[PDB]
Amino acid sequence: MISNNAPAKMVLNSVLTGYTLAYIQHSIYSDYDVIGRSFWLKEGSNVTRRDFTGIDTFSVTINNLKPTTTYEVQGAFYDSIIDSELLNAQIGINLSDKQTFKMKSAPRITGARCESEPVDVGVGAPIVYIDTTGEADYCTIELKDNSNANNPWVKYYVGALMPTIMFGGVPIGSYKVRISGQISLPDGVTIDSSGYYEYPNVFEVRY
């Protein structure tokens, strides 16, 4: 009549998916003999396994997330009663219900164009119409003078993404736009960025 009741079933309270990392909120444990967690991920056709030794932490942040895919995550706890072998087998170890989380896509540009009213006379503001279709919270946009060989990049607008981003005050001359971005997480220190993405072809502003 002696037994080691395994730690209760694992639940995943909340999921927040970054570009390359997901911050997952979980429940509390028991059984006096736990070692860590064993998270299984369903890429769609292939599975990966990770371990998180140390339990003082209250949430997990998976990394190395393959871009642009919805993953199914499996939570779990394990004690010394079950070894690494049985952990690989995943029998006797309690497992979580099935939850799938979406990876927010990278900041994507869909249209860049200069435009204003047909100038009658005088100096008029030429607007820049750059259209992005991704998702982030600290998107960055930079321009570079195409004419010269070396042109220290310049960043002009920093803010949330929009179907059409328009800002004036740009010089008339040659300028091509790159796109960047970052995504925040409740864990203060962690901050995930995005790869630079320059438009395939430059555009030129003119009155």
């Binding site: 002696i2 037994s3 006096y32 010394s80 070894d83 072998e85 029998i91």
Partner: protein, 105 residues
């Protein structure tokens, strides 16, 4: 007949991977030298698992390998670890007979 490596707070719970079985010496060791202990371990579903004789030692451990492979495979023909167990032990001799009654957890 007590279990070494026992859980704090509640004693009906394990704390280590291998349960350590410790028992105190039977008083009549002196009179009869040729005496051993028959330790047989049962399951959660009242099914015999082990029948092991202990001699020249007043303690026994139940290794992880044993439960996880041998007694999972030979009984359920698969890999597993019976978490809930029952241990009982008594004293016997080559010519001297059994103990008066079973000593169970």
């Amino acid at each position: 007949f007590r279990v070494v490596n026992t859980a704090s707070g509640d004693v009906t719970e394990f704390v280590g991977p291998d349960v350590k079985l410790a028992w105190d010496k039977i008083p009549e060791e002196e009179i009869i030298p040729e005496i051993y202990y028959t330790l047989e371990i049962y399951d959660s579903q009242d099914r015999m698992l082990r029948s092991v004789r202990i001699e020249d030692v007043y303690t026994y451990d139940y290794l992880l390998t044993y439960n996880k492979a041998d007694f999972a495979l030979l009984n359920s023909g698969a890999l597993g670890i019976n978490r809930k167990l029952r241990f009982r032990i008594r004293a016997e001799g080559e010519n001297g007979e059994q103990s008066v009654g079973w000593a169970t957890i």
